[model samples]
Target: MSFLLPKLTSKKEVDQAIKSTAEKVLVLRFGRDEDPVCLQLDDILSKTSSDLSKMAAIYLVDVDQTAVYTQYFDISYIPSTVFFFNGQHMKVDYGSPDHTKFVGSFKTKQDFIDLIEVIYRGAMRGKLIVQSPIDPK
Candidate 1:
């Protein structure tokens, strides 16, 4: 069976997703080049993005070549997804779950729409966290 999901492997894909009509985009940055967790998250986000309308986009950033983005975003985790609203940064965090929970959390288009609405409203109110600095000990 053909799997349904967005598999982003290049900067071009990332740029396209961000520029897409979708008001909200999910930019996933993985630490290692071929980490399993990163792959898992990619699959989850891809599946989620596929089901949703044009409300969301999923992009995978390779830490190896795109170290600048990782450094700029201060992302220290392997699998992290940064949420964007209205072409602006909103939130950043790692998405949990493998398969069932991933699909269950965002099963329908309405779920994705609801999520974008919440983020967009929060952005307008300046309530969303724009960036997260790396915490050095």
Candidate 2:
């Protein structure tokens, strides 16, 4: 389902993506379209990509297509959503078992919306780490 999203093909593109993104949180999803989990994430991405134009910029990175970044990011799993702000990596605690990155498809478009908002706000505040608004109360 990479066809559903723009695919980042090289380290240069990935680098430019992370560095070129201005104040908006750069949301890069690293995964293969063949994976079911990735497809799930892609669907949510397609739905919210435009909705977040003001707050976040979403992109899909094919682990196989962009191996350079996959290894650079050390993404051992598909469906990993890494957030970056002005060239800096942003960390979101989603109450997951491990929080180096978002490990799975968010529950819904709204979940990611909340996640993006939290990331954007925290980053603007000069906070590197932010708690997920997607997490249940």
Candidate 3:
């Protein structure tokens, strides 16, 4: 299911995806395809990928495959959604213990879209961290 979207298989590929993405939010979903939550998130991502094309470039990264990034992001759970823009990591305060990433699948499609919109606005203004529009839970 994760294969529904593009993937970054190597550290260099991950670097290129983040650095070369230029002006849009780079959505890096770090999770294994076999995880149920990951598959669910990937389903939403596949459905919304085209719709969110102008605002973000979505990609899937299997943690088992991309060890460097998994370690870099400290992704312990499956379906951790990390955002980046213009070669810099963009943090979202999800009101969670972790501010480095948004863990687990979003509650709804609108919720995910809202989150991305906030990230887009924040990134455009050159912000590394932005308050989440809604509580992640």
Query: How do the residues 1-97 of candidate 2 rate in per-residue lDDT, one tens digit apiece?
Result: 2225677777789999988889998889998878998887889898888777898887888888888778877888778878899989887788875
Measure candidate 2: CA RMSD.
2.9
The lDDT for every candidate, in the order shown, is: 0.49, 0.82, 0.87
Q: Which stretches of candidate 1 lie over 4 Å from their true place?
A: 1-22, 31-33, 92-117, 120-137
Model 1 C-alpha lDDT per residue in residues 7-125, reported as the tens digit of each score: 55565665566566354445444444378765555455555565544545555566666665666666666655556655566662214322101111233434444554555555557
Clashing pairs in 1: 6-46
lDDT winner between candidates 1 and 3: 3
Identify the candidate with maximal lDDT. 3
lDDT assessment of candidate 2: 0.82
**TM-score rank order:** 3, 2, 1
Between which residue pairs do clashes occur in model 2? Answer: none
lDDT of 3 by residue, 1-137 (tens): 23268989988899899878988999999998889988888888888888888999999998988888899898888888889999888889889768889998988877888899999999999889999997765
| TM-score per candidate, chains pooled | 0.56, 0.89, 0.94
